[PDB]
Amino acid sequence: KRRKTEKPSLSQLKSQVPYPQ
Amino acid sequence: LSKGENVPYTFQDEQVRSNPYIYKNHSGKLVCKLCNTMHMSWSSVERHLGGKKHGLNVLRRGISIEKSSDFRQQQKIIEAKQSLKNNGTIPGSVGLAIQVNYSSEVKENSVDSDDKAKVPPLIRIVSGLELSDTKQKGKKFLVIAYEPFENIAIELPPNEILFSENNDMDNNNDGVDELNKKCTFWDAISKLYYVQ
Amino acid sequence: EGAEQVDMPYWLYKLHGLDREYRCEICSNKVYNGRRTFERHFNEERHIYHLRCLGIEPSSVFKGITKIKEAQELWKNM
Amino acid sequence: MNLLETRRSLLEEMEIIENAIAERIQRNPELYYHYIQESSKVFPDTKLPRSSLIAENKIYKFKKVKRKRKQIILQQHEINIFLRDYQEKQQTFNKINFERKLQQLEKELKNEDENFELDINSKKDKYALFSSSSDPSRRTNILSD
Amino acid sequence: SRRDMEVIKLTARYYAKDKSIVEQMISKDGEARLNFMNSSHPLHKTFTDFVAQYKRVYSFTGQEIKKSKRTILDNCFERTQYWEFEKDKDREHDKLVELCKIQFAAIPWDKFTQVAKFDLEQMRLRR
Amino acid sequence: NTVYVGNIDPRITKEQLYELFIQINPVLRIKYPKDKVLQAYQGYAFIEFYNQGDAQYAIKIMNNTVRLYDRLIKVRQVPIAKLFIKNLADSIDSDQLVKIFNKFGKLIREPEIFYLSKLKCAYVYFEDFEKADLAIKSLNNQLVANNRITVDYAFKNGKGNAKYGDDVDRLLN
Ligand SMILES: [Zn+2]
Ligand SMILES: [Zn+2]
């Protein structure tokens, strides 16, 4: 429940990525 | 169970098929191209055809076609009746009139069980593009039919004759079609069918 | 009056994933009834108009966008 | 006033009423049947329909839906006033029953040419004045206007 | 429409007694007012009605109608009965038509055997 | 980049299109649809070049040029403010609406007159959220043609949200 709702947004995840697409 | 029919493989690059659907793919199995379902035996194929699944896909394919844009028990003695063609004329053009006569209570004495007995003869305009022999074609026929007697045809080279314009005052009992109600008479008491 | 005597793909749209409530934030807070459809929104005229006219240039890096805000910092990263 | 027109309108209205109470007797034959049965025991001569018709609530081939008492009685009183109207009109009617004049009147008919107005309210207002469900917007009250 | 109505009903009033006054009026005046006299003009039909009606009033002039309540009721019942009958005829007709459609749809229009190549309304009656 | 091509004979095949357009420019990709129902070509294709320079070039030189199966080959190249206004007068013409809202802001399209309930209403498209705010501020609950009209945002729920000013500002930019 809390872990399922704890997830960061995919766009928040894009910034960590050198090849975000 | 195959009834001796030959179903060609899908890759053999298409003789008319009974159902142009069930095929055999590169492998030996049988498939329904529409349904995309594999079938082990011809019995399974027949279960597929008799199944509602395949039928639904057939209706969907017919809808795709539109998007892209009593018959059994019919008595038949095949007896040629006697027609009486005659060049007519009124006003303001020229039209044709046919007088078809029928039996004189000679053989109709054995069949009187109100089975479409009340139904009068029917006429339809058929294109010669389709015939049992399919040799020559290109003209129309004014076919006239009655249950027991044999069908009759009359060639109509002229593109249009007597094709009137709102003869009566738009009354809607379609019967069979505008043609029949518009210009036919059935003297049932004397058994004489007039058409013009 | 006139009762005289004489004498649709329900389970299919759930299976396919459609008719399910969803919303795109960047487009007019618009509603979409299927996830395949919203995944098709990523390549569209209006969606790319909102991006490009917003200053966030088109095509394939921004596909997973929903809200207008995050893709702004993403475009600053671009 | 040309009496011909008046007597005409009278016969026409009478026709309208007969047609109304006939439509009624049609939708629910009981209306007549009920009545007639009672009549039977007051004036012995009266001929009454086949029992089967009465029971199956039919007049010819179609058996009509059975109605509740309150409605049957209602419509019977409505038909009552209708028959009253009819009797009145019949009465007045009994008490009521050249070229130069033709052009003479046709000339005066030119009077008030600029009368922009649609007139579809003589037979419609009467037909309507005596028909089923004439009160509500569409279908709420069986009573005629 | 009061004008049209009035002229129709008036020419109908006169037309109901003589039929000669109107045929003279048409030739005397020459006005596009009575254009309903020809069966071409739609309204003509309704005209044929009114006149008939007036013709009817001339029927029992000098005779009173003495219908009683009982009778009026009986009559309305019989009218109802008639309507029911007519309704039944309509039904039957619809049925026969249906049969015809079925059979027409169900016969071989490819069983050809031709021989050669190339007012009924008053005829579809009896006399 | 990508060019539309049309008026194509289904007998024209993919290799024939490729060999045709390589004569004009280099062809990156060819999408040439195939009808699954009819098992035939539907008679129009899409040729994606390596750039809009060769694309537009092929549009200029190719259009109305090649004749394939006697049929000519065709080539063709491949979000605003909305105010709902209620209780308008029957004497209010759409052009009169145009005149009324021009002073407040430029209209991207023409007004849309429709009837609710009897009730004359219209949709007015402004190019600017701020000019729309002007027509709202001045024209809300006002009497024109002796009739009180109401001016607000049309529903999408209604326009004029916070993200709406932000993105409409950008579409203006
Ligand atoms: Zn199948
Ligand atoms: Zn979107």
Q: How does this model look, in words?
A:
This is part of a larger assembly, with one copy of chain A (21 residues), one copy of chain B (196 residues), two copies of chain C, one copy of chain E (127 residues) and one copy of chain F (173 residues). Chain B is 16% helix and 20% strand. Chain B is built from three helices and ten strands, in the order βββααβββββαββ. Chain B has helices at 42-50, 52-68, 178-182, and strands spanning 22-24, 30-32, 37-39, 86-87, 96-101, 122-127, 140-145, 155-156, 184-187, 192-195. In chain B, the strands form three sheets. In chain B, strands 4-5-10-9 form a four-stranded antiparallel sheet. A three-stranded antiparallel sheet of chain B has the order 1-2-3, with helices on one face. Chain E has 127 residues and is an all-alpha fold. Chain E folds into two domains: 1-25 and 38-63, Arc Repressor Mutant, subunit A (Orthogonal Bundle), CATH 1.10.10.790; 64-107, Single alpha-helices involved in coiled-coils or other helix-helix interfaces. Chain E contains four helices and no strands. Chain E is flat and about 65 Å long. With 173 residues, chain F is of the alpha+beta class. Chain F has five helices and eleven strands, in the order E-H-E-E-H-E-E-E-E-H-E-E-H-E-E-H. Chain F is elongated, with a radius of gyration of 25 Å. The complex binds zinc ion (2 copies).
Query: How much helical structure, as a percent, in the residues of chain E?
Result: 55-70%
- CATH architecture designation of the largest domain in chain E: Orthogonal Bundle
- Write down the domain tally of chain F: 2
Q: What is the end-to-end distance of chain E?
A: 43 Å
Number of beta strands of chain E? 0
Globally, the shape of chain E reads: flat
Structural class of chain E: mainly alpha
If strands are numbered along the chain, what order do they take across the biggest sheet of chain F? 8-9-7-11-10
Biggest β-sheet strands, sense, barrel of chain F: 5 strands, antiparallel
How much helicity do the residues of chain F have?
25-40%
CATH topology of the largest domain in chain E: Arc Repressor Mutant, subunit A
PDB class: splicing
Keywords: Spliceosome, Splicing, Ribonucleoprotein
Entry title: Structure of a pre-catalytic spliceosome
Chain A: Cold sensitive U2 snRNA suppressor 1
Features:
part of a larger assembly, 6 chains, A: 21 residues, mainly alpha, 24% helix, rod-shaped, B: 196 residues, alpha+beta, 3 helices, 16% helix, 20% strand, binds zinc ion, Protein HSH49 (chain F), Nucleotide-bd_a/b_plait_sf (chain F), mRNA processing (chain F), RNA-binding (chain F)
Brief digest:
Chain A is mainly α and 21 residues long.
Topology:
This is part of a larger assembly, with 1 copy of chain A (21 residues), 1 copy of chain B (196 residues), 2 copies of chain C, 1 copy of chain E (127 residues) and 1 copy of chain F (173 residues).
Chain A lengths: L9 H5 L7
Chain B lengths: L21 E3 L5 E3 L4 E3 L2 H9 L1 H17 L17 E2 L8 E6 L20 E6 L12 E6 L9 E2 L21 H5 L1 E4 L4 E4 L1
Chain F lengths: L1 E5 L7 H8 L5 E5 L13 E5 L2 H11 L4 E2 L2 E2 L1 E4 L3 E6 L7 H9 L9 E5 L2 E8 L2 H11 L2 E3 L2 E7 L8 H11 L1
Antiparallel strand pairs in F: 1-3, 1-6, 2-3, 4-5, 7-9, 7-11, 8-9, 10-11
Bound molecules: zinc ion (ZN) (2 copies).
The site of one zinc ion has 5 residues of chain C, from loops.
